[PDB]
Every structure is written in C-alpha cells, then in structure tokens.
C-alpha cells in the first residue's frame, strides 16, 4: 500500500469530507499555533504598518486521519494533499495585506501523526498594521501586534491557543535597522465578540525600541550647531549692524527649514512630539 | 510509438504515476543538484536593502519511475505542460521577499527526462532578495548579497 494509503486516508476513498470539521457536533477544535519570523522590517511611520515574513504553524487533532498501516510515529506528506483536508480558517485581524508564497511550489508543510495530529506550516508575508504613538518619537518604544483570529467558526467549533513553550520564534541574525526587537514577546488573548457571536483570537505583542543614533546625527546635531553660531553674534562688534543682522536672518530661516525636515520622515500627527519641542525651542 | 501514447504511459493518464509520492519513497533522500543562471542584477537599493534578479533555476534529480525503453535517445526534451504531473522539489528562497514566475506567452518552464530517470527542471524566476548590508564605510563599502535555496515541506531525511 504505497499509494492507496493516500487514497484511503483522505480523498477518493474512505469518504473523508474536508468540509466538516474534526469531531463534528462535539467539543471545539483547539488549534495550538506558533510563529517563526524570518524577516521583520519596513516599519514605516507614514503608513503605520510593518512587514514580517513568518512561518505560521498550527496543530489540531483530527480523529479521522489516524492510520494503522505505517509504523511511523509521524508521516510527512506532499503539500498537494494539503487542500483535501480540514484546516482552521484563521486570519489576521490587522492583516492590511498578506500573500502566500508559491515560489517553485506552494510553500506548505503537512504532517499527519499516528493518532491524527496534523501539523500545518505555511509561509506568509503579512504586512501588518502597527498604530504607533509618537509622543516621544525620536526615542519611543512601540508595540506592534499580531492578531490571529478565526472568521467562520465561533468559539463552539474552533479555539486557538499558543504553543505552551516557544510560541514566537525569531531567526538568528534577524536585526532590523533603526530598531531593536526585544527578546520578550507578550502572548495574550484578543477574543473578539462580534455581531455574529463569539470568535477566537490570540495575539502576539512585539516590543520595539527606536535606535536613536540616526536621529542624533540628522536631527539634533545640525539644529544644535545652528543654535551655536547664533551665539557668536555677541562677540562681533555691535556697530556692525548689517554684519550682525546677517547671522540671525539666515539662522532663523535655517532652523525653519530644519524643523520642516523633521516632518517628511514622520506622519502628520496632531499632537506635539519630543523632537518638535526640541526644534521649536531651538527655533526660539 | 505515437508519443501521445508514450506521454500517457510514462506519466499522465496511465502507468499509475503519483506526483504526490517522492521518488525513492521510504528510501534514500532525493539529492537535487541545482545551479542558477543570472540574467541581470539591478535595483540594489540601500533604502529597502534588497535587490532583484531573474534567474534560470536549474535543478536535477533522479526519479527512477521515469525511465523509458521506447525511444533510444539519450535525453528527451518534453513539453512544459507535462511539468505539472511529475514530482518537483519544493524549494523556496529564505530571503525571497517577493518572487514570481514568468508567464509571458507561455510557461517559462523546461523539462527533459533522461533515459535513466534524470530530470532537468529549468524555471525562469525574478526575485527581490533581501541583502542586509553593512554601511559602516558606505562610499567605499564592499557588500555581500546572498540567495538561500531552501526546502520547506521535506526534511533532511
């Protein structure tokens, strides 16, 4: 039975119905899921989003995928047999755009254990949305979230929970520029009560700290330097009216163009930031 | 022998070829000798820290159930439409960051099956690889960009 097993397991034989969830009219389907992030970058303040390539894995028991033929504990399968079995219909509540990867094959992984446990790993780009408070922009610490949520199954048919240990996994050399991803990642529930009932949700908190070294060069030093030469007009003679006035008249506009330059790198936010009350006071 | 009748006996309709079962099932791992041919680099952006390139990813493997004794040819160049009915190693790019096949006027796929079971699989792929660069000496820097041809669904075993 080298290939009839795949037929008698699911598809063309044994009457496997991929439309009916496991253990129908029974307890819900606890889907233990964990995340592995490959890349974590492109964190734009203008768009309030970030792109994070991840491998989304998730296990769930399925009592009608238990086999007694091969003595193997687990059993790797071809991803083409991944469209003929049930799968939890989760999504990302703050998705804002997310696509699969079909580079040379569907980047999918299937593994049906001896008792029915179904591992399921897929790659996703998932340019999530990260509403970030910029009250202290140059030296702020944001928290970009990732909400894994069910859509078509209430919390009587499908329940999600993180891996008990090691749920979020970061690549080794993953170092995004201008930020540093803290090793602590908060895993909490985000259960969504919508108009149509109880819906499963589980999020992962990412704490990011802004590397101040860049803004220390482009923002603070030039405006700091522009304020310094405004002081050396007191050392020049006071009778030199046009020469003395030449300093301030160009430095006033100089700080004005500097303060404007601190905006294109940022969104158009209403309140005042940590750099605005630096550029404004230096303008003063 | 009316190659419409031969393409159905080698694969496709008859002979019971399952493209879901790996070659040498429950046997040694399917080693895949693969090389690349880069048509063009370009758009090496320091802002995004990436770079796009289209390549002809060629990869060869031995599939023992594609051996034929009908045509005396050494190799046998087939039609790319007969490429979706055979096993193919599912390699991705660990720094893929956006890649797509080329469908212009046809499938840009190549498939020739040698007389013993060998399979040459050439595919044309553009892909914007992620190249984390060190700009400590930016104007005089010497960067190092990579592409990782990794497998996803099949383990090392």
């Amino acid at each position, epitope marked *: 039975s080298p290939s009839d097993f795949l037929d008698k397991l699911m598809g063309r034989t044994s009457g496997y119905d991929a439309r009916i969830r496991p253990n129908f009219k029974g307890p819900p389907v606890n889907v233990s899921c964990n995340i592995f992030i490959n890349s974590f970058g492109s964190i734009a303040e203008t768009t309030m989003d970030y792109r994070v390539n991840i491998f989304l894995r998730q296990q769930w028991n399925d009592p009608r995928l238990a086999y007694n033929e091969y*003595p*193997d*504990d*687990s059993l790797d399968l071809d991803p083409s047999m991944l469209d003929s079995i049930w799968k939890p219909d989760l999504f990302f509540a703050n998705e804002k755009g997310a696509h699969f990867h079909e580079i040379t094959t569907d980047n999918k992984l299937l593994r049906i254990s001896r008792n029915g446990n179904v591992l399921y790993s897929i790659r996703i780009t998932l340019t999530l949305a990260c509403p970030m408070d910029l009250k202290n922009f140059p030296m702020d610490v944001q928290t970009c979230i990732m909400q894994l949520e069910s859509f078509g199954y209430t919390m009587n048919d499908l329940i999600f929970e993180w891996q008990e*240990q*090691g749920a979020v*996994q*970061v690549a*080794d050399g993953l170092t995004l520029p201008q930020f540093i991803l803290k*090793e602590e990642k908060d895993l909490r529930y985000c259960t969504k009560h919508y108009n149509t009932g109880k819906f499963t949700c589980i999020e992962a908190r990412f704490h990011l700290e802004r590397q101040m070294g860049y803004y220390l060069i482009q923002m603070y030093i030039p405006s700091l330097l522009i304020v310094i030469l405004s002081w050396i007009s007191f050392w020049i003679n006071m009778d030199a009216a046009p020469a003395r006035v030449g300093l301030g008249i160009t430095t006033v506009l100089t700080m004005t163009t500097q303060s404007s330059g601190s905006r294109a790198s940022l969104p158009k936010v209403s309140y005042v930031k940590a750099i605005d009350i630096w550029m404004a006071v230096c303008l003063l | 022998m009316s190659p419409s009748d031969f393409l159905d006996k080698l694969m496709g309709r008859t002979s019971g070829y399952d493209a879901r079962i790996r070659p040498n099932f*429950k*046997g*040694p*791992p399917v080693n895949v000798s693969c090389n690349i041919f880069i048509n063009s680099f370009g758009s090496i952006a320091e802002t995004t820290m990436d770079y796009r390139v289209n390549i002809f990813l060629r990869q060869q493997w031995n599939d023992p159930r594609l051996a034929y004794n009908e045509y005396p040819d050494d190799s046998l160049d087939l039609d790319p439409s007969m490429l979706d009915s055979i096993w193919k190693p599912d390699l991705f790019f660990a720094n893929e960051k956006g890649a797509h096949f080329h469908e212009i006027t046809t499938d840009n796929k190549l498939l020739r099956i040698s007389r013993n079971g060998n399979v040459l699989y050439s595919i044309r792929i553009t892909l914007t690889l992620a190249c984390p660069m060190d700009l400590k000496n930016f104007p005089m820097d010497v960067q190092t960009c990579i592409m990782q041809l990794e497998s996803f669904g099949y383990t*090392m*075993n």
Partner: antibody
Amino acid sequence: VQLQQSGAELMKPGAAVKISCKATGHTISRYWIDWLKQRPGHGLEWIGEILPGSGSTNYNEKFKGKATFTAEKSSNTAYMQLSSLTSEDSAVYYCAMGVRGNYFDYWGQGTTLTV
Amino acid sequence: IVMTQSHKFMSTSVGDRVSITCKASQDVSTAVAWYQQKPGQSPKLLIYWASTRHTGVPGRFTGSGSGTDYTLTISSVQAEDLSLYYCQQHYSTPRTFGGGT
C-alpha cells in the same frame, strides 16, 4: 564548530545533576543539540534533543522524566539535568549535533558521571 | 528500532578485509552511520547514509547494503583501525546505535 561540556561529575544516589554543553563557534539557538549516553558494557544511547531557541525537545521514551533539557542564550550553552540518580546512571554523557541529517558529526569531549 | 550487530569482537592483522554486519529490525532506509571511538575520546563520524564519507575520513572506509542488512568494509586495515565501531540508524525518531565492535 565545537562543543565544550562540563568537567567530571560525582553525585550521590538520589540527587540530581545538570550537565552543560558550551557551544563555541555558532549561536546555540541555531542547531539541534542532541544528548547521548555511553555506559561501559553497552554502546551509545540517544537521550533526546533540544533546539535552544524555541524550547522544543524530543526525549527518548526511556529517559522521559529523567533528563530535562534547557538552554541559555546568554551563555550559548545547553543544559541537561538528570534527576533521581541511581546506580544505573554511571556512564559518559555526550552532546552531539547533527547538522545535515539525523547522524552525529559533531561531539563534545564527554562528561563522566558516577552514581 | 533495534540495530543488532552480529559479532562483538573482531581481530585481524594489517591489510585485511572485514565485514562488520549491522542488521536492523525494520527497513528504515539506506540511512546508517558508522562511528569510530578510540578509547578515551569522543566518537567520530565515518560513514553516513551507509555510503558517504565525512570530511576527513581518508579512504579504506566503504559502506553498503540496504533494507535491513548493512556492512562497513575495510581492506587497508592499519593498526589504528582496531577500535569501537558503532552502526547508527537515523531513519526514525528514537535513534539507536549498534552493539559495538
């Protein structure tokens, strides 16, 4: 790539011992670290495996509850901890690391336990 | 899975052909590794997948076999080849070596 274990151990019947495996040449959270057991009178024996970055482990059936795998990215070291030591634990414990397969191409010097 | 080597001890002079059989209980794969452990040090990898050679194993080490029968043959047996030889199956979750030789 190299793996530096701890020195010789000497424990009493009933206590617990924690063996380390220092990784000097690669980030400890990179590869699966395997733990073996060599006892005189028998060949080697595979204890389990721990991926020091994800906290995942695969213990052998015989060693569940006996060995506890941990890790510490601050020191690049994986930790094995045997508990409820008896006279059947006197052996040599290795921490191999198979990179391109389920074999063991990298090894440590071997820690000697005596209980 | 049980990796049952037949003979425990084997001795012969320099330049001899010896077949170190390692018969497994299940036809796992051609996945079999052969380790050499000189007395007092860590074992070393010689053959993996029953046919390949690890980096630094110079000649006179050749595996063979398939299914459940294997062999580690050596012809130019120097004096530094009389040691412990372990066959290892790595085609299953619980990894098990042989009985040494």
